Design a protein around this ligand. Structure first.
Ligand code: EVE
Ligand code: EVE
Ligand code: EVE
Ligand code: EVE
Ligand code: EVE
Ligand code: EVE
Lengths: 264, 264
């Protein structure tokens, strides 16, 4: 992979692996989400990070995902090469946004797009905070200054408000817990695991559809010793679902989201 | 990746990804096992397999792993390039063996090695069978004829007999169940998931202070999509452990194995 000529975005190519595909012999949405995370990490490394700035590491501050939105038109097949372009944009004092464009390397056509909202949090107390000028000045030189949106459209699905699922849920998967493969290098549950857990409450029959859109709001983390319940209710040619992940015991919300599926 | 000059082995290079590493910023043993599986698949594709041969497909016969043995001297770091060489050998009428050699792409030094025993099974009845003669002749042209062993030495750990763990187990992780990310493209639980489940009963104190050096795993029965597994471990000693995976209900054995850990 490499930074583009202007140094304001990063591209990388990936060959889809045998264990990365589902029943249709195409990449799962979790494989896609792992590749978005990998190209984001490679971009941060290429521009001098290790994505905490100098002032952030001094103040024990980190970027955390508040929302992730992915739209897939075509999932790449096993053995196919997918090219992904990523970049960051400042959103004033609210936080930052990382966007992605996925393309078929052979045709050059756009096969998917993703966007994510990131907030500044103290690593120790987990308290959120606005972006200071000192921190902002350190990362603005790595972002395009004019707007560059993966989802330009006026009433697009990436910024919609998500409601809280009401009991009883239509579908559920109970007692989900992470294993060591679900953790990142800092021993925290990887963001992609939550997408997998959301999808566990979708019935196997829904074999007949392809996932087109997924929007996920991250509220709280699942710790290593926590157990999660995954809840889903149909809200709808296309099937739409409302999702909720909550801790098995007290019922504390950890995530909420929506999925849109289209008939194969 | 590509077949070597003689067409009797296959090599491929992999760049270690951010989500593929553990707390030491080096590849997990599950990442290694996924890469061995991927290079094995690429080898079978390069030599004309759609690793079932024409006669196997007509007879509804498949290759299944009976035993896997991996020894790691150094785990590649995040961003490092690891080169893996693989080949197959015929073992008379018992079945086939696939071997692997892992190397640091920069130094050319051997950083690990693996071996696996495969048996022929009817995909519908799950009945084991010897390899006939028509089937052997179809894949012997893709194997070196003289012996080529990843573990040549006499009395090597790759061929040792593994006993059955006696109750009570010293350590345990109960109620493990696969999610969709744990399945392969044929909707069966991926072999690497079983390695993860075995490792779930090792205490965090051991993982934090030791590195896994050797793992031998015997595969006896499948965990189906609706099954629940219990992972059991007892120290038999470097630290050595004896492992057992069994179904949560009836206690039916699915796997047994051993691990050897070196103090960091
Ligand atoms: N944006 S947040 O609500 O502070 C937040 N982001 C998260 C990402 C993963 C897990 C928990 C999180 N909590
Ligand atoms: N994204 S998160 O899961 O909320 C999170 N919080 C963290 C605190 C310290 C180190 C890594 C972290 N990751
Ligand atoms: N994957 S985990 O839930 O973080 C975890 N922590 C563990 C500590 C001891 C034994 C197994 C474990 N699995
Ligand atoms: N060799 S076997 O005992 O027939 C066998 N191999 C297997 C691999 C994965 C899961 C179940 C298996 N059963
Ligand atoms: N290796 S296994 O998990 O025992 C297995 N059995 C299978 C039968 C049909 C298709 C794939 C299979 N994989
Ligand atoms: N990953 S799995 O255990 O094969 C599985 N099968 C499922 C069927 C319906 C809903 C969730 C599921 N998860």
């Amino acid at each position: 992979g490499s930074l583009t000529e202007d140094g304001l975005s990063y591209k990388e190519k990936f060959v889809v692996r045998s264990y990365e595909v589902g029943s249709n012999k195409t990449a799962t949405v979790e494989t896609i989400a792992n590749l978005l995370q990998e190209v984001g990490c490679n971009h941060a490394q290429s521009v001098g990070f290790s994505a905490t700035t100098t002032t952030m590491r001094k103040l024990h501050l980190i970027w955390v995902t508040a929302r992730m939105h992915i739209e897939i038109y075509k999932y790449p097949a096993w053995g196919d090469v997918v090219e992904i372009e990523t970049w960051c944009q400042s959103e004033g004092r609210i936080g930052t946004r990382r966007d992605w464009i996925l393309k078929d390397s052979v045709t050059g056509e756009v096969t998917g797009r993703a966007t994510s909202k990131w907030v500044m949090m103290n690593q120790d107390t987990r308290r959120l905070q606005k972006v200071s000028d000192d921190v902002r000045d350190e990362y603005l030189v790595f972002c395009p200054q004019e707007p560059r949106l993966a989802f330009p459209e006026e009433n697009n699905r990436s910024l919609k408000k998500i409601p809280k699922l009401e009991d009883p849920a239509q579908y559920s998967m109970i007692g989900l817990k992470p294993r060591r493969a679900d953790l990142d290098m800092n021993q925290h549950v990887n963001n992609v695991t939550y997408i997998g857990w959301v999808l566990e409450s979708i019935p196997q029959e829904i074999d007949t559809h392809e996932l087109q859109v997924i929007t996920l709001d991250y509220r709280r983390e699942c710790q290593q010793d926590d157990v999660v319940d995954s809840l889903t209710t149909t809200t709808s040619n296309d099937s739409q679902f409302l999702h909720l992940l909550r801790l098995s015991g007290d019922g504390q919300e950890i995530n909420r989201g929506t999925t849109l599926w289209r008939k194969k």
